[PDB]
Amino acid sequence: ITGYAACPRNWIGVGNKCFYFSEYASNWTFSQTFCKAQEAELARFDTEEELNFLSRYKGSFDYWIGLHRESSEHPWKWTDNTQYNYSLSIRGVERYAYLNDIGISSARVYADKRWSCSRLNSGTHHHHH
Ligand X SMILES: *[C@@H]1O[C@H](CO)[C@@H](O[C@@H]2O[C@H](CO)[C@@H](O)[C@H](O)[C@H]2NC(C)=O)[C@H](O)[C@H]1NC(C)=O
**Whole-number Å distance between alpha carbons of 9 and 57:** 16
On the CB side of 87, CA atoms within 13 Å amount to: 0
Task: Check binding of 100 to another protein (CB under 8 A).
Answer: yes
Strands (E), the chain: 12-14, 17-21, 41-42, 63-68, 96-99, 104-107, 114-120
- Min CB(27)–ligand X separation in Å: 4
Question: Which of Zn ion, another protein, ligand X, none does residue 30 bind to, with CB < 5 to 8 Å depending on kind?
Answer: ligand X
SS3 (DSSP) at 26:
strand
When the beta carbons of 39 and 112 are compared against Zn ion, the nearer one is 39
By CB under 6 A, which span of 14-22, 27-35, 82-90, 95-103 interacts with ligand X?
27-35
- Site mask, Zn ion, residues 1-40, x = CB under 5 A? --------------------------------------x-
